[PDB]
Design an enzyme around this catalytic site. Sequence first.
Site, mmCIF file in Angstrom:
data_model
loop_
_atom_site.group_PDB
_atom_site.id
_atom_site.type_symbol
_atom_site.label_atom_id
_atom_site.label_comp_id
_atom_site.label_asym_id
_atom_site.label_seq_id
_atom_site.Cartn_x
_atom_site.Cartn_y
_atom_site.Cartn_z
ATOM 1 N N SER A 44 0.793 -1.240 0.000
ATOM 2 C CA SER A 44 0.000 0.000 0.000
ATOM 3 C C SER A 44 0.822 1.285 0.000
ATOM 4 O O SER A 44 0.253 2.369 -0.078
ATOM 5 C CB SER A 44 -0.992 0.043 1.169
ATOM 6 O OG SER A 44 -1.766 1.225 1.149
ATOM 7 N N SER A 102 -5.076 2.410 4.445
ATOM 8 C CA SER A 102 -4.589 1.483 3.417
ATOM 9 C C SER A 102 -5.761 0.782 2.735
ATOM 10 O O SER A 102 -5.736 -0.435 2.489
ATOM 11 C CB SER A 102 -3.623 0.452 4.010
ATOM 12 O OG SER A 102 -2.519 1.119 4.609
ATOM 13 N N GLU A 142 -5.054 -3.746 -6.282
ATOM 14 C CA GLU A 142 -5.305 -4.551 -5.081
ATOM 15 C C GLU A 142 -6.314 -5.655 -5.398
ATOM 16 O O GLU A 142 -7.280 -5.417 -6.123
ATOM 17 C CB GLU A 142 -5.829 -3.669 -3.941
ATOM 18 C CG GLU A 142 -4.863 -2.580 -3.479
ATOM 19 C CD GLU A 142 -3.768 -3.098 -2.580
ATOM 20 O OE1 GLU A 142 -3.717 -4.320 -2.329
ATOM 21 O OE2 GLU A 142 -2.939 -2.286 -2.122
ATOM 22 N N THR A 211 2.057 3.174 5.261
ATOM 23 C CA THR A 211 2.546 1.810 5.445
ATOM 24 C C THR A 211 2.214 0.928 4.246
ATOM 25 O O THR A 211 1.500 1.334 3.328
ATOM 26 C CB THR A 211 1.884 1.154 6.660
ATOM 27 O OG1 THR A 211 0.460 1.186 6.491
ATOM 28 C CG2 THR A 211 2.251 1.887 7.937
ATOM 29 N N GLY A 212 2.731 -0.294 4.275
ATOM 30 C CA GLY A 212 2.295 -1.300 3.331
ATOM 31 C C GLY A 212 2.551 -2.657 3.944
ATOM 32 O O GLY A 212 3.531 -2.829 4.676
ATOM 33 N N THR A 213 1.677 -3.614 3.658
ATOM 34 C CA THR A 213 1.838 -4.960 4.194
ATOM 35 C C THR A 213 1.311 -5.902 3.133
ATOM 36 O O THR A 213 0.339 -5.582 2.446
ATOM 37 C CB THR A 213 1.019 -5.153 5.483
ATOM 38 O OG1 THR A 213 1.400 -4.170 6.460
ATOM 39 C CG2 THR A 213 1.194 -6.530 6.051
HETATM 40 C C1 LIG Z 1 -3.105 -5.321 4.849
HETATM 41 C C2 LIG Z 1 -3.570 -3.910 4.953
HETATM 42 C C3 LIG Z 1 -2.650 -3.249 5.977
HETATM 43 S S1 LIG Z 1 -2.041 -4.084 7.402
HETATM 44 C C4 LIG Z 1 -3.481 -5.059 7.730
HETATM 45 C C5 LIG Z 1 -4.589 -4.115 8.104
HETATM 46 N N1 LIG Z 1 -4.486 -4.629 9.485
HETATM 47 C C6 LIG Z 1 -5.122 -4.400 10.625
HETATM 48 N N2 LIG Z 1 -6.263 -3.738 10.757
HETATM 49 C C7 LIG Z 1 -6.689 -3.654 12.007
HETATM 50 C C8 LIG Z 1 -5.894 -4.251 12.907
HETATM 51 S S2 LIG Z 1 -4.607 -4.910 12.071
HETATM 52 C C9 LIG Z 1 -3.503 -5.609 9.127
HETATM 53 C C10 LIG Z 1 -1.483 -3.020 5.280
HETATM 54 C C11 LIG Z 1 -0.844 -1.831 5.777
HETATM 55 O O1 LIG Z 1 -0.683 -0.930 5.099
HETATM 56 O O2 LIG Z 1 -0.439 -1.876 6.852
HETATM 57 N N3 LIG Z 1 -1.854 -2.891 3.928
HETATM 58 C C12 LIG Z 1 -1.716 -2.817 2.615
HETATM 59 O O3 LIG Z 1 -0.616 -2.562 2.120
HETATM 60 C C13 LIG Z 1 -3.151 -3.517 2.369
HETATM 61 C C14 LIG Z 1 -3.845 -3.299 1.246
HETATM 62 C C15 LIG Z 1 -5.342 -3.666 1.264
HETATM 63 O O4 LIG Z 1 -3.892 -1.920 0.963
HETATM 64 C C16 LIG Z 1 -3.360 -3.525 3.694
#
Ligand SMILES: C[C@H]1[C@@H](SC2CN(c3nccs3)C2)[C@H](C(=O)O)N2C(=O)[C@H]([C@@H](C)O)[C@@H]12
Length: 267
Positions: A44, A102, A142, A211-213
């Site tokens: 993200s 995100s 996404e 952030t990004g995950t």
């Molecule tokens: C996975 C999300 C977030 S981290 C995810 C959201 N989380 C939580 N929400 C509430 C408690 S933990 C774990 C994660 C992020 O930015 O942290 N991110 C992306 O990158 C995607 C994508 C849909 O844009 C998402």
Amino acid sequence: AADLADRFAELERRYDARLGVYVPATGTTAAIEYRADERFAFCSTFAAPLVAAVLHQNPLTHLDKLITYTSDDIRSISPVAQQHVQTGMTIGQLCDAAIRYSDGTAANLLLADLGGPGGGTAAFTGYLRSLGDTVSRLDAEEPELNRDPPGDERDTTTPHAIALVLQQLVLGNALPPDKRALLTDWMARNTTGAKRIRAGFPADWKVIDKTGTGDYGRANDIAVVWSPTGVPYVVAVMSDRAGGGYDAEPREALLAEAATCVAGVLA
Ligand SMILES: C[C@H]1[C@@H](SC2CN(c3nccs3)C2)[C@H](C(=O)O)N2C(=O)[C@H]([C@@H](C)O)[C@@H]12
């Protein structure tokens, strides 16, 4: 510092991870770089320059345009868009959600707003090229952009490349002051980053971030930080844990520790 590269390598061993870090040079600090030119998935983090692209492309009042969408548009984690599907969201609301939550549906709709081939991915990449980034590429939206195998160059940037992009957007003149402020404020109000770069800097430092995950234990954070006396630094930290395969858990703590090491040098 024992040295910094040694500290980053220790973190890689602790988290069974690959860590990339870049902080651009300033007047009095050398660039900090660790695997800074290795590719890592955007995840993200791309949403920050995506919002910049959409801002740049349109009059400011394009933020007030209502965008409608429905069930089949919700394909990814979308904390805000899932809540507003019955009413629609303005471009401004979409920018807010894409950055601060995100929100993947928000990012997807903003890509579609930017328009052109690849559902907006080509124009997004073209925006980065206009900022002198010849390295980064976006190929999918996404959720697919989170899933490329380790080493695959699709949907990647580098700590070095994304730091220089973010530097132009927030500190430089990539955007006019009004649009620059919109972007900066959205990142300032981010809700997803408290355990990442923010965790590594003292509370009297200002932190704004995106952030990004993703899969393969991917966890990134890009930030602009300001010292208590208003000296800004750009911090890009990226990581993955390919050794754990697709379901490897992302580990925020790694980013918090990496940022703490950076903050120690910048203080
Ligand atoms: C996975 C999300 C977030 S981290 C995810 C959201 N989380 C939580 N929400 C509430 C408690 S933990 C774990 C994660 C992020 O930015 O942290 N991110 C992306 O990158 C995607 C994508 C849909 O844009 C998402």
